[PDB]
Amino acid sequence: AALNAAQEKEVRALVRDTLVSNPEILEEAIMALQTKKADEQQAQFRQALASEHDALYNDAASPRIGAKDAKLVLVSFTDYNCPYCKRFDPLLEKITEQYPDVAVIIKPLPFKGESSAKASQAVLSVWKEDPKAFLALHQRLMQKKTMLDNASIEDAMKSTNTSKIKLTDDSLKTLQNNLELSRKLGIQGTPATVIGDTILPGAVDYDQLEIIVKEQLAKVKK
Amino acid sequence: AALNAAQEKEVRALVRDTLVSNPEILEEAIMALQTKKADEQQAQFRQALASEHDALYNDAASPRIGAKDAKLVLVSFTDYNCPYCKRFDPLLEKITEQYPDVAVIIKPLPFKGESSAKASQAVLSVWKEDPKAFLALHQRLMQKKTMLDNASIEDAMKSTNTSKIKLTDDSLKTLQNNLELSRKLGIQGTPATVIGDTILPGAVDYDQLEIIVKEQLAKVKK
Amino acid sequence: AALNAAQEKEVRALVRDTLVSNPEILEEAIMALQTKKADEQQAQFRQALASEHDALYNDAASPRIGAKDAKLVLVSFTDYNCPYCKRFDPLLEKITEQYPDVAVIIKPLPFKGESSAKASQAVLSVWKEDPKAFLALHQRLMQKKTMLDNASIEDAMKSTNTSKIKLTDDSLKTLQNNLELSRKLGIQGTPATVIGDTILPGAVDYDQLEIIVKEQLAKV
């Protein structure tokens, strides 16, 4: 609404024209990227959670398994082709409303491949249009053994009534927010679950996960 | 325009600032492309052959060896640094005169290095301004034993009377189209030749190639 | 007054949006850079000195150690993580102190890593806001044994009163200019020093460097 369609499309042509005509802009943006990675990589961890509370716990684009109004919320960084995530996600859903004032926030990651980014792109695109339709797709993207492809996924989005949903480019923005966050939180292992100022890197026994979520509910008010 | 030079002047400045101030935009586009590569890589070669018919056969930026109006048209994805292409390219030119109803469209590829991109950038730039000078340059770049540099390329140019010719950035657009089409068609080797309804991957003995294309001249008779 | 603030942000959204919806714009721009890089590597060394004299000697963004009034100007491509530059940089302040008609322009390079690029970005940012404080930071980053970190750089700024200065993105253009310039000049070792029409690559004994710069003070 700031720019008109005629203005808006000329700008889109200029982006292409400028980067190719002046490639020096690109290498500058490359070194600037490799630098910002280091700025986040060599940061202080706890103060990341105090400064990243709004992106972790208050992202409207981040899928949630459980109640939207809960006192304790877990954040699970996951990959749909990672065997350990497939082994832990069920443990994360069972704690949801066996312990009802606890919910789980999903942060999909593109670590193990292109399908990981692709599967994430599907899951995030679904979350905005029909949030309740997320779960069925989420479980089968997880419970499907082997590295999914666009073909394996076209079967998955179809066993969940989510095939009319288009993978948006804006859903890719969120996947990135999750990716920068893993670095800011210093996570290069998945699964990773944030449960209140602390991170859980790896698969943990249910009865231990059980104790942890209870200890963090003691950490809250009355 | 739509935009005035001053506005146009700011847009070129903002793209630099945007990419440098927010470098994460870049890595987002990096995986988005690795994603897009795979979507083209995992495309169906038939519906790739069917949907890329105008891109293969009706690109004015793609050089043609043979008759302008021919019914059988071969599309050769080539690289000027490929040892096999140098020995296969003459064989494709022999068919264009033994069989006047056959033409060959050159689809240069930048697989084997940066010089390949530069050499491709040259022939495509020449073809757009003066098509008649292309073949001489094409052959001198191709039939050149050993790797290419800007000097070896520049030696082949006025030695074909063509260094007055500018290497345009729009020729990169065509090289790029050649690059994406190669992925949609499932091409993991140069040379690669489109021969009707299937692709011929590799350097082939002439008499093997001969039977193949007359077999393709039988399917259009007239 | 070309674009309004609302327009300036939509343009920022469109550049972001356009590159992601059409990632192919990027890949075309990737090999335009890889091509441009090779074009610089395959330049003739001397005609690179002749064609970018304006970039070497007349960049207001390039720090200078010595007199604004000098007849001879040295251009030293250096790295704050290169041990040879740490042994050569002190020798460069002596000639500017031995010979007041000689000056030194610093051309930082991010060759040995990301730490090199950040450290350069810190030093260049100071030069733009507080030129007088540059030398102190420059010297303290140099005499630092071992590689630098985000902490090590920031500590050297606190030890020189330059921590209040922000690392600008405008310094990356300069950092980038030095990198393309290093390629055109065919520099694959630091230190590298432009001394009129020749480059002297490496840490050299003072008495060798002295004879050279006096000999070129004879040619001017």
Residue numbers in the entry:
A (entry chain F), B (entry chain A): 3 to 224
C (entry chain B): 3 to 222
Quote the study that presented this structure, word for word:
Although it is annotated DsbA-like, PmScsC is a powerful protein disulfide isomerase that is able to refold and reactivate the scrambled disulfide form of the model substrate RNase A just as rapidly as the archetypal disulfide isomerase E. coli DsbC. Unexpectedly, evidence from chemical cross-linking, small angle X-ray solution scattering and multi-angle light scattering all indicated that PmScsC is trimeric. The N-terminal residues bring three catalytic domains together into a trimer, and a unique flexible linker enables extraordinary twisting and extending motions that impact on the catalytic domain placement. The combination, extent and diversity of these motions would enable mis-folded substrates bound to PmScsC to explore a broad folding landscape, consistent with the redox foldase activity of this key P. mirabilis copper resistance protein.
The three crystal structures—which we refer to as compact, transitional and extended —reveal an extraordinary range of motion in this protein. Importantly, the compact and transitional structures have multiple protomers in the asymmetric unit that adopt the same overall structures in each case (8 compact trimers, RMSD ∼1.5 Å for 645 Cα; two transitional trimers, RMSD 0.5 Å for 653 Cα) so that crystal symmetry does not appear to impact on the observed conformation. Moreover, the compact and transitional conformations were determined from crystals grown under similar conditions (2.85 M sodium malonate pH 5.8, 20 °C with either 0.1 M cobalt or copper added). Nevertheless, comparison of the eight compact and the two transitional trimers in these two crystal structures, reveals an unprecedented level of conformational re-arrangement (RMSDs>20 Å). In the 24 protomers present in the compact PmScsC crystal structure, the linker forms a loop that positions the three catalytic domains close to the trimerization stalk. The eight compact PmScsC trimers are mushroom-shaped with dimensions 80 × 80 × 50 Å3. The two compact protomer conformations of the transitional structure are similar to those in the compact crystal structure (RMSD 0.9–1.8 Å for 188 Cα).
